Amino acid sequence: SNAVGKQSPANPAPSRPLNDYVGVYANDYWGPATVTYHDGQLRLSLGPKNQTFDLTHWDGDTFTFTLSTENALPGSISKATFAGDTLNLEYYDADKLGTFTR
Numbered sequence: 001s002n003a004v005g006k007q008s009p010a011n012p013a014p015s016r017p018l019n020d021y022v023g024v025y026a027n028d029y030w031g032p033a034t035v036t037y038h039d040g041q042l043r044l045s046l047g048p049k050n051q052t053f054d055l056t057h058w059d060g061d062t063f064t065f066t067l068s069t070e071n072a073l074p075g076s077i078s079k080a081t082f083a084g085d086t087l088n089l090e091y092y093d094a095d096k097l098g099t100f101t102r
């Protein structure tokens with residue numbers, strides 16, 4: 001079996017019911033972040049071509065996704081933090097334009 005490295009939270013707080021996260025979170029700069037639910041899975045869609053990522057629970061209202069093979073760093077883990085009607089995507093927040101609001 002794979003060696004273990006503690007790179008996920010061991011004792012995370014549970015998520016809310018998954019319906020709570022679903023919606024279209026607006027942003028003028030990056031365009032909307034669309035969060036949808038299918039067969040137990042939250043997904044994040046970004047851009048005009050609907051580039052889509054599975055959201056994996058991390059801790060509390062924070063999820064992660066893994067970057068695509070088009071990225072400089074495919075498979076790197078990126079945080080998606082939900083708080084009320086906001087979604088913060090750390091990948092897009094370098095100039096503080098990474099909050100999306102539904």
Ligand SMILES: [Br-]
Binds near residue numbers: 003
């Ligand atoms: Br690990």
Ligand SMILES: [Br-]
Binds near residue numbers: 009010012
């Ligand atoms: Br923990």
Ligand SMILES: [Br-]
Binds near residue numbers: 011
């Ligand atoms: Br703990």
Ligand SMILES: [Br-]
Binds near residue numbers: 024025
């Ligand atoms: Br919505």
Ligand SMILES: [Br-]
Binds near residue numbers: 025026027
């Ligand atoms: Br928008």
Ligand SMILES: [Br-]
Binds near residue numbers: 025027
């Ligand atoms: Br929109």
Ligand SMILES: [Br-]
Binds near residue numbers: 038039041043
């Ligand atoms: Br799915």
Ligand SMILES: [Br-]
Binds near residue numbers: 047048049051
């Ligand atoms: Br796109």
Ligand SMILES: [Br-]
Binds near residue numbers: 050
């Ligand atoms: Br669409």
Ligand SMILES: [Br-]
Binds near residue numbers: 052053054066
């Ligand atoms: Br994915």
Ligand SMILES: [Br-]
Binds near residue numbers: 055056057
């Ligand atoms: Br999960």
Ligand SMILES: [Br-]
Binds near residue numbers: 015057
């Ligand atoms: Br979950």
Ligand SMILES: [Br-]
Binds near residue numbers: 059060061062081082
């Ligand atoms: Br959180």
Ligand SMILES: [Br-]
Binds near residue numbers: 067069070071
């Ligand atoms: Br990507």
Ligand SMILES: [Br-]
Binds near residue numbers: 076077
């Ligand atoms: Br990583």
Ligand SMILES: [Br-]
Binds near residue numbers: 078079090091
């Ligand atoms: Br990132």
